[PDB]
């Protein structure tokens, strides 16, 4: 899984989960398909190195990239746009690893997908590997070290005797998520305890939410990105959920899907912002 780099000379020899590539030092035409790593390009001030972004799903907090050429959205990738960009590096995560072999036949292709078993070290590893390509380890490391400092302050104020449920809404169905899921940060990094123990979505309904009776419900609404009419606020407005501690104490928290579901915490900007979003809610 983890990312290792050996300095040849003009270039690095980089091994990741999917394979090995000859990527040059200071690549100047980069296609980026992971949104978290695109916020990490912005943090380290490398906007001009980015030649193409997936503009279909481009979040509010990355609209400084709205006029980069589009190479698609996160599901469907435009090979003929990526192709005409003559990039020297393409960066992808899990949603594009389907196309690993075809993108590799165009350019060195770096996988930077997160490991939900080891979020912090795989996150730190992705950020540093990228900064290593441009010689910005120093700047990245102090930015990581800030994030770690904000984490410890978020933990301080966590009340250990309270439990949380994480759920995702889709059309009018609901799914539960736990530890080491794609949303596991809340449990694994910030240490908020889970109401239930269950494998890495899990289909549930409102009676399940009540017999569990969480103090917090963190809600990720997929409907927005999917372009559906319905919303989580509508779905969770029933008399079963109204009886939970979380409802009675107004601790049903709608998390920003652009952060939690699209970038998934895989950037310097997004992770810091997500830690603060939880901090202010469990406060
Ligand atoms: Zn600082």
Domain residue spans in the chain? Answer: 1-157+256-283, 158-255
Separation of alpha carbons 111 and 48, rounded Å: 21
For residue 38, how far is its CA from the centre of ligand 1 (angstroms)?
Answer: 20
Ligand 1 center–CA 149 separation, angstroms: 10
Resolution (in Å) of the shown entry?
2.4
If you measure from the C-alpha of residue 188 to the centroid of ligand 1, how many angstroms do you get, rounded to a whole number?
A: 24
Neighbours of 269 (CB within 10 A): 19
How close is the Cα of 140 to the center of ligand 1, in Å? 10
Contacts of 49 (CB under 8 A, 6+ apart): 27, 28, 29, 30, 41, 134
101 Cα–ligand 1 center, Å: 39
Which residues lie closer than 8 Å to 84 by C-beta, 6 or more apart? none
Which residue pairs from 92-98 have beta carbons closer than 8 angstroms and sit at least 24 positions apart in sequence?
A: 92/33, 92/34, 93/33, 93/34, 93/36, 93/37, 93/264, 93/266, 95/33, 96/33, 96/34, 97/18
For the domain 158-255, what is the CATH code?
Answer: 3.40.50.1980
Longest dimension (CA), the chain: 65
What is the 132 CA–ligand 1 centroid distance (Å)? Answer: 19
If residue 139 lies in a helix (H) or strand (E), which one and from where to where? helix 137-156
- Asked, colleague to colleague, whether 1-157+256-283 and 158-255 share their fold, the answer is yes
The answer to whether 123 and 265 are in contact (CB under 8 A) is yes
User: At how many degrees (to 10) do helices 119-134 and 137-156 cross?
Assistant: 160
How many angstroms is it from 131 CA to the middle of ligand 1?
A: 16
On whether the CB atoms of residues 261 and 225 are closer than 8 A, the answer is yes
Which residues have a beta carbon within 5 Å of ligand 1, which is an ion? 146
E strands in the chain: 4-7, 11-15, 20-24, 30-32, 50-52, 89-92, 109-111, 163-170, 173-177, 193-194, 202-204, 216-221, 252-255
Span from the CA of 146 to the centroid of ligand 1 (angstroms): 5
Strands 202-204, 193-194: pairing kind: unpaired
- Plot region of 140 (φ>0 → left; ψ -120 to 50 → alpha; else → beta): alpha
Q: How many whole angstroms from 43 Cα to the centroid of ligand 1?
A: 12
> For domain 1-157+256-283, which CATH number applies: 3.40.50.1980, 3.30.360.10, 3.30.450.20, 3.40.50.300?
3.40.50.1980
Ligand 1 center to residue 12 CA distance, Å?
Answer: 28
Alpha-carbon distance of 264 to 252, in angstroms, equals 20
Distance 185 CA to ligand 1 centre (A): 22
φ, ψ for residue 109 (rounded to 5)? Answer: -125, 115
Which experimental approach was used here? X-ray
* Cβ atoms 78, 72 nearer than 8 A: yes
């Amino acid at each position: 899984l983890p990312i290792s780099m050996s300095d040849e000379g003009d270039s690095f020899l980089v091994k990741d989960s999917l394979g090995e590539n000859k990527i040059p030092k200071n690549p100047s035409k980069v296609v980026i398909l992971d949104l978290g790593i695109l916020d990490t390009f912005d943090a380290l001030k490398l906007n001009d190195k980015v030649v193409g972004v997936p503009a279909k799903n481009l979040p509010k907090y990355l609209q400084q990239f709205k006029n980069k050429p589009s190479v698609g959205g996160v599901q469907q990738v435009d090979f003929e746009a990526i192709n005409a960009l003559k990039p020297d590096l393409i960066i992808i995560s899990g949603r594009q690893s389907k196309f690993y072999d075809k993108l590799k036949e165009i350019a060195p292709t770096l996988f930077v997908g997160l490991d939900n078993a080891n979020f912090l070290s795989s996150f730190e590893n992705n950020v540093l590997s990228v900064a290593k390509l441009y010689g910005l380890e120093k700047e990245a490391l102090e930015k990581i070290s800030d994030i770690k400092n904000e984490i410890e302050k978020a933990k301080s104020i966590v009340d250990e005797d309270k439990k949380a449920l994480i759920i995702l809404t889709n059309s009018n169905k609901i799914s539960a998520f736990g530890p080491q899921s794609r949303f596991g940060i809340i449990h694994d990094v910030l240490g908020i305890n889970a109401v239930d123990e269950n494998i890495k979505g899990k289909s549930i309904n409102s009676e399940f939410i009540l017999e569990k009776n969480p103090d917090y419900i963190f809600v990720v609404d997929r409907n927005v990105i999917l372009g559906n009419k319905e919303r989580a606020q509508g779905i969770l407005d029933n008399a079963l959920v109204a009886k939970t501690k979380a409802a009675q104490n107004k601790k049903i928290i709608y998390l920003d899907p652009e952060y939690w579901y699209l970038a998934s915490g895989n950037g310097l900007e997004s992770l810091k912002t997500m830690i603060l979003e939880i901090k202010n809610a469990v406060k």
